[PDB]
Amino acid sequence: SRRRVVITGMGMLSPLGLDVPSSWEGILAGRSGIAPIEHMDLSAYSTRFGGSVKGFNVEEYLSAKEARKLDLFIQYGLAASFQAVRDSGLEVTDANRERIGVSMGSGIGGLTNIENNCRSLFEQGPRRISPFFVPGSIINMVSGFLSIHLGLQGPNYALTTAQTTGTHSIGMAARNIAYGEADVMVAGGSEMAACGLGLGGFGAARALSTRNDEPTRASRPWDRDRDGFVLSDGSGALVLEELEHARARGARIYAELVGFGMSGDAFHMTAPPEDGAGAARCMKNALRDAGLDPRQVDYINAHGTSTPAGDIAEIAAVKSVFGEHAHALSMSSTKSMTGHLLGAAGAVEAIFSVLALRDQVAPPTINLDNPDEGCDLDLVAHEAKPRKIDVALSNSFGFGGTNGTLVFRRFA
């Protein structure tokens, strides 16, 4: 037997806005967050654009002195997490602090910091490496710093499952609460890889869209002219809470987390299998986990990265899992607007899945001008679609063939 887990606070930094309601406003308007990257020489790079967080002010959250110690990915993680805790109204007390934990992850961690400390190392030698290099760059420091700032003494950890991080972080946090290891968890992910090493590293594998002329049209999941993913920055955090705990203090409940699925493709380091066999098993696992029949699913927030092999794999997976229901559900890539926030993708897409439930609206797949061969599902081309949504899925399918699926349900 198992406790029920609800969403009582959400927080976000995205290429679309500095919080949830502003990000969600852009999502439903089909606005693009993608733009050429500024204050950075990308002359020798084949990709010169992505989704930046615009106008982030870390001094709303931290002193200038504490923020100087921390990589951007950690700043962004703390911002979404502080937002999510404030959004929840939860009061931390000596009576509950041991029951409140954190699992905020990252796919790639502190590349920006690693790059600036490399610059100092090569130019001037090791004696110019920042004393805060290690604690200021390691992925578990969003969980670390958040626990220290708020006095959280519950489970304290960090996932790193590349592009699956945010989905796994939220799912495993839900498990902690369901099986009684915590009553509250702050979970999600953050990322800032759209630095030299992120653009160069992914650009070297030719994984990135090179559509420098039309950056807002670059991210075009299931469109026959897609040429790979758009690199994006930001964070999502959710406050996950045991139902009775949330009801007792009179929390505002956005939605219930009913289902979590995991699988491994065991196929290829970067490419999914053509038929999405792994993504199929993971969605089936998530629906079994939630005790739901595939027929009950109304809305899927796809992984939808705009990679040719990735997008077609997800069409196959859904047709295989949903059979004659596959056309009835709506499925959209919000990455058409946000780009791919990698380890944070699952976190911001879980929030969009929750908000699709609250507002009864499927977010668009923008730029889906010419669906590809086989891409005949309801991919919500171009514009948001108001519709009935009781059950929403959020999928992540990342490098190493690691799969995550979250099942959200309306709560009333």
Q: Which of residues 33-92 bind its own copies (CB under 8 A)?
A: 44-45, 69
Closest CB 137 distance from ligand O1M, rounded Å: 10
Residues numbered 182 to 211 that lie near its own copies (CB under 8 A) are 196-197, 199-207
Q: Which of 166, 234, 272, 398 binds its own copies (CB under 8 A)?
A: 398
Closest CB 70 distance from its own copies, rounded Å: 9
Residue 148 interacts with ligand O1M (CB under 6 A): yes or no: no
- Pairing status of strand 299-301 against strand 330-332: parallel
Residue 29 interacts with its own copies (CB under 8 A): yes or no: no
Q: Which of 4, 46, 116, 135 binds ligand O1M (CB under 6 A)?
A: 135
Residue 102 interacts with ligand O1M (CB under 6 A): yes or no: no
Q: Looking at beta carbons only, is 40 or 328 nearer to ligand O1M?
A: 328
Q: Looking at beta carbons only, is 105 or 198 nearer to ligand O1M?
A: 198
- Strand partners for 256: 6, 409
196-204 and 111-124 helices, crossing angle to 10° = 100
Helix (H, G, I), strand (E, B) or coil at 316: helix
- Pairing status of strand 255-264 against strand 5-13: antiparallel
Q: Looking at beta carbons only, is 342 or 356 nearer to ligand O1M?
A: 342
For residues 292 and 410, the answer to whether their CB atoms sit within 8 Å is no
* Contacted by 102, from ligand O1M, its own copies, none: CB < 5 to 8 Å by type: its own copies
Residue 360 interacts with ligand O1M (CB under 6 A): yes or no: no
Tell me how far apart the alpha carbons of residues 101 and 155 are, in angstroms, rounded to a whole number: 5
* Contacted by 295, from its own copies, ligand O1M, none: CB < 5 to 8 Å by type: ligand O1M
Tell me how far apart the alpha carbons of residues 75 and 82 are, in angstroms, rounded to a whole number: 11
Q: Which of 99, 211, 226, 281 binds its own copies (CB under 8 A)?
A: 281
Site map (CB under 6 A) of ligand O1M, residues 310-339, x = contact: ---------------x--------------
Which of 235, 110, 253, 229 is closest to 169 using CA atoms? 235
- Number of other residues whose CB lies within 10 A of the CB of residue 189: 41
Tell me how far apart the alpha carbons of residues 350 and 259 are, in angstroms, rounded to a whole number: 12
* Stretch binding ligand O1M (CB under 6 A), from 2-10, 100-108, 132-140, 212-220: 132-140
Closest CB 134 distance from ligand O1M, rounded Å: 4
Tell me how far apart the alpha carbons of residues 168 and 282 are, in angstroms, rounded to a whole number: 12
State the SS3 of 343-394.
HHHHHHHHHHHHHHHHHCEECCECCCCCECCCCCCECCECCCEECCCCEEEE
Q: Which of 296, 320, 384, 385 binds ligand O1M (CB under 6 A)?
A: 296
* Contacted by 217, from its own copies, ligand O1M, none: CB < 5 to 8 Å by type: none
**What is the residue type of 235?**
S
Residues numbered 118 to 177 that lie near its own copies (CB under 8 A) are 118-119, 121-123, 125-127, 129-135, 137-141, 143-145, 147-148, 150-162, 164, 168, 172, 175
Residues near its own copies (CB under 8 A), total: 88
Residues numbered 183 to 212 that lie near ligand O1M (CB under 6 A) are 202, 205, 207
For residues 287 and 293, the answer to whether their CB atoms sit within 8 Å is yes
Q: Provide φ and ψ at 270, rounded to 5°.
A: -130, -25
What's the residue count for the chain? 412
Q: Which residues of this chain interact with ligand O1M, rule CB under 6 A? A: 131-132, 134-135, 202, 205, 207, 270, 293, 295-296, 325
